[PDB]
Design a protein around this ligand. Structure first.
Ligand SMILES: O=c1ccn([C@@H]2O[C@H](COP(=O)(O)OP(=O)(O)O)[C@@H](O)[C@H]2O)c(=O)[nH]1
Ligand SMILES: [Mn+2]
Length: 439
């Protein structure tokens, strides 16, 4: 068995890094198709496309000469939750005649007229989703061998193949694949898996297709790729052996002189040797802070890019850090798909108002099911969330390679988070300790 995940990008997203980590945890051999190449498959958000996925898959298949079983899948919004033995057993059971199995889903798209051409079935999971499929290398090769246009629609291509041929079967019972979109009430997390209570199955591949990225990101916080080490926090005093260089980017407003002094005093007490400090002041109105810049109304990345710093540590004036070893603690969490980390702090006079959002609806705050549990530390860890504010540690691989300056909301903190979401760079809130408060 080989898993061919489509990851066409010059630099890796957190989606692909997460997919790789889940593949490794489940002993799945995999190739990232299209790694290092520029995406030309279209703006999938506002328009369909994805033909380039087919063309890159075809090139990859030229390296795989034997007729082996292959899974072909999305990577940005998809993870495996089990290993090759379960996959092979399910495949054999689903298709004794070794057909290509595609994911099912709730909706018939992009061509509504196909509704009446699909086989009639006694399930809501009626239609093809082209985001995950499995079959023999030669069968898949035969379907795609003439290539397509980069901007052709791969969803439509495979829908037509299903309807018109006998080469494809759909995974109606969600055994191998789960298209999660609008199936929230079917699904629970149990024993490190998704359980679909509608189908009575444990789907191997969890696909947060469309807006269900939010749901998969949510469930991620409850899954494991390795056991918790319960002793990681037993001493809450963290010290790095060798300190990477951290660029402190302080967003200040000297108009509020007393708030500024108090903030700078706390920042000066963060224990870290290898650093450079820049002050970015909103006011137009300094001996202790040579790198001082005035009239700044946006987040600034160019000074960091020109530096040799390994991390960018964004701190806003209204966030008061009290945990002196916090930078050591945060850096220890930066690995794999965990590259943007924000410690959870609450407002001093009502700690349920924090510096993250658990959910988002049309770009605005929505209360997630576990929001209050995180804010009150009923459960702790790292959580993939749509917005973080005020204290953000970002690895250089993010800041040096991605446009963090995209504009939607005309608000610096909201637009930074929009930028990251758009690039499939994840924001992780961490609430393992008491870090501070907001004013
Ligand atoms: O720059 C890009 C954009 C997308 N994709 C791949 O195309 C898939 C389809 O996009 P998406 O999952 O967002 O589509 P959806 O499942 O929401 O229709 C992604 O998961 C990736 O595997 C890629 O490789 N590079
Ligand atoms: Mn997808």
């Amino acid at each position: 068995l080989l898993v061919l995940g489509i990851g066409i990008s010059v630099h890796k997203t957190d989606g692909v890094l997460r997919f790789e980590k889940y593949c490794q945890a489940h002993n799945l051999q995999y190739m990232i198709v299209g790694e290092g190449k520029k995406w030309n498959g279209g703006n999938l958000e506002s328009e369909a496309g994805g033909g380039q996925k087919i063309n890159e898959l075809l090139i990859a298949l030229e390296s795989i000469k034997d007729n082996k079983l292959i899974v072909v899948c999305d990577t940005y919004d998809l993870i495996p939750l089990s290993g090759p033995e379960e996959i092979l057993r399910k495949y054999r059971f689903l298709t004794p005649d070794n057909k290509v199995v595609f994911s099912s889903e709730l909706y018939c798209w992009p061509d509504a007229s196909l509704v009446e051409r699909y086989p009639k079935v006694d399930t809501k999971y009626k239609y093809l989703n082209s985001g995950a499929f499995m079959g023999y290398r030669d069968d898949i090769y035969e379907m795609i061998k003439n290539g397509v246009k980069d901007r052709d629609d791969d969803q439509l291509f495979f829908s037509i193949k299903f309807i018109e041929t006998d080469k494809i079967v759909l995974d109606y019972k969600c055994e191998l694949f789960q298209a999660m979109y609008r199936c929230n009430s079917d699904l629970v997390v149990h024993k490190n898996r998704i359980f679909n209570g509608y189908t009575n199955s444990y789907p191997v591949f969890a696909h947060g297709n469309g807006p269900a990225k939010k749901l998969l990101n949510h469930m991620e916080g409850y899954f494991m790729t390795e056991p918790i080490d319960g002793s990681s926090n037993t001493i809450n005093t963290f010290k790095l052996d060798n300190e990477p260089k951290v660029f402190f980017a302080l967003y200040v407003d000297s108009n509020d002189l007393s708030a500024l002094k108090q903030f700078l005093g706390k920042v000066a007490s963060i224990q870290y040797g290898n650093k450079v400090i820049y002050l970015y002041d909103r006011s137009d109105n300094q001996i202790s802070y040579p790198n001082y810049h005035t009239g700044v109304t946006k987040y600034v990345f160019d000074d960091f890019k020109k530096s040799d710093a390994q991390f960018y540590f964004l701190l806003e004036q209204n966030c008061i850090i009290t945990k002196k070893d916090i930078l050591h603690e945060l850096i220890m969490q930066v690995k794999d798909n965990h590259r943007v980390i924000s410690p959870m702090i609450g407002y001093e006079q009502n700690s349920t108002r924090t510096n993250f959002w658990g959910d988002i609806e049309d770009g605005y705050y929505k209360r997630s099911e576990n929001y209050l549990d995180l804010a009150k530390h009923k459960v702790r860890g790292l959580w993939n969330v749509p917005y973080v504010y005020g204290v953000i540690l970002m690895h250089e691989s993010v800041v040096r390679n991605w446009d963090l300056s995209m504009v939607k909301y005309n608000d610096k903190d909201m637009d930074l988070c929009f930028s990251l979401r758009k690039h499939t760079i994840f924001m992780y809130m961490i609430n393992n300790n008491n870090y501070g408060y907001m004013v």
